[PDB]
Assembly symmetry: C4
């Protein structure tokens, strides 16, 4: 659990996120909880040119490490860590299906039993605020109080979990749920859902 | 036809299922008929970390082999083997188009002549029941009486055949049929179908 | 222009057709004009297991070479060669967008200037008849009189051209046109088209 | 900044454009500003067979280099360089989502904050004119006056930027925006947009 090992894992998560089709260009960013702050990828460096030296340490006070590039969306990663003590890794991306649902400003309802992976019977959609603002941070903190993932209106997705592998796995499951929702919404609105009783049973089993 | 060779084949089927885009994360599972029970993949191990030692033998009585991980959906694989004596391999996944049709709770009708590959003029959709329950097992057993594949409402797909290669091949053909159905349903409902007379001719030819 | 070189080229076309996402499983088949008949791939052998020895010579009289596997759709390849003397290679597949348009039983109209690549202002859709029948052959022969590609209702696509590379290239362009048509049809029906005057200009330029 | 290095970069951009799924077959073409004209890829050579010797120099007067293949869409690349002095690289392709929006003859409105990457609150759609004509060149020049990318009605996309990497990056972001727009248009028309006030804030931040 030293810095260089975590940096390697962050870079591998970025590569896998791109291979799964969730990250295109420079939209995504990943972080892990570390010491009193987090290690995060910088803005604007494509995944394939990322090296261990690019990873930035931002402390608990928001001070950025000397000589590193900026990460313009760092504030909502820190908001996730403060809102969910149990989160140790945060994945952000603008995956296409998640993002399309966020444009409609809809939560994803219980259309499939795997919705329980994010903690409840829905994937919420937090209201729009400019990237990098305190306002956006507060909406994210409130959406993650009782959920491990949330859509960001007109923006994309945030998913958090106990480690990088589970956070990426969750981000991918939410993109699958978003694709299922949009595909079925085009045919019938509203889409059939499982009852709260049924999701309660699934949550216990998980 | 020894255990290690079949284990290898199960792992290769998992890899191919992922390459074809039918399996994402840990949703899919594959089994083969073996001795008095079956060999199956365990729950929660991503395809890329699967080894021969992970494959679990579950006997005819439902006893799990010592020291292996659980497979929470094993009951509907055993239900398939008991319902269809001719089935020697079972593929389960949550492929996106198959799963979207299962959310609509519709059977796939005879929109293409390749629907006859599953045995008749449709791909049924079995009613929802919690994963791992006897109730879900009974719905699957009834749906597979006269069909080699079935959708599972709010869940995914089950396909069975005489060997692993044909079972995967069938699972992929059903995902293609589901994509054809959703794509055309978005434009016109209902979608034009081939008559029962025409499917009877195709079934004889196959 | 010896048999072994053409067999190699047929196998490479099969591989590329799969890489482009146009061919899945065992649905596609490819042929080239050769001596008094054609060389074609057999039914049921997946692309990855195809060898030079699998390629079948079918003469002008329809006699199949000794000891080879059958090709159940050979008749419409021969119908293409007889209908279009200029065709030297024929590609058949069940590409998803082409096939979805064929289920709707619609021709693809001039929604994009590249429609002229198939010879006119449309991609026709030939009426359904059972695969392998003389009836299906006659519908294909008539559809290809003035076009180099045609959809097959409830079935898929046939594209022909002067060599294997151009035939595959055309098949891919028709799949792109079909995807453009279905994507726009879901939003507005009918879809805006270029006038016959404009397609005439493009045809001259090509 | 010698010719051979730029030729290599053009070929690598072509390969990456194909890997990202933006270019299929021979539809796309790329250029860079060079001396008094530009270096561009020729018409009809598939990306995989492109060599450094294929790259064509077209001067400021429109004279083509001796012994090279033609590039039938060269005129709108030159129109981009003359209209936008700051552009040093131009990417053209017929990416499917961009092209479908161009068939509808719609601009892409501010459905996502990344629309500001092209310079304003929209991606315009320039009116149809035959490829290779002065008329098409004039429509492109006018559309790029205040935007770095534009759709071409019934045709495709043009994107320009300060170097090849940023031009490709922009082309991909516009294809993502087009996919978001079509996916949401199928569910609700019109699609919710960010206000001009909000895009003004984002533009300043960028
Ligand atoms: Zn973002
Ligand atoms: Zn399942
Ligand atoms: Zn066929
Ligand atoms: Zn073009």
């Amino acid at each position: 659990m030293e810095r260089n090992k975590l940096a390697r894992q962050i870079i591998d998560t970025c590569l896998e996120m791109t291979r799964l089709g969730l990250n295109q260009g420079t939209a995504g960013n990943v972080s892990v909880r570390y010491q009193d702050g987090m290690l995060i990828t910088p803005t604007g460096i494509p995944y394939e040119k990322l090296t261990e030296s690019h990873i930035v340490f931002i402390d608990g006070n928001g001070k950025h490490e000397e000589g590193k590039l900026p990460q313009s969306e760092w504030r909502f990663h820190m908001a996730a860590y403060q809102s969910r003590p149990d989160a140790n890794a945060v994945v952000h991306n603008h995956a296409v299906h998640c993002t399309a649902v966020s444009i409609l400003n809809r939560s994803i309802p219980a259309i499939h039993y795997m919705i329980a992976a994010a903690g409840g019977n829905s994937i919420p959609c937090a209201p729009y605020a400019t990237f990098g603002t305190r306002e956006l941070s507060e909406h994210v903190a409130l959406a993650l109080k009782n959920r491990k993932a949330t859509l960001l209106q007109h923006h994309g997705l945030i998913a958090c979990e106990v480690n990088l592998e589970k956070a990426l796995w969750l981000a991918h499951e939410v993109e699958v749920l978003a694709q299922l929702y949009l595909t079925t919404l085009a045919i019938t609105d509203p889409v059939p859902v499982l009852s709260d009783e049924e999701i309660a049973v699934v949550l216990e089993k998980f």
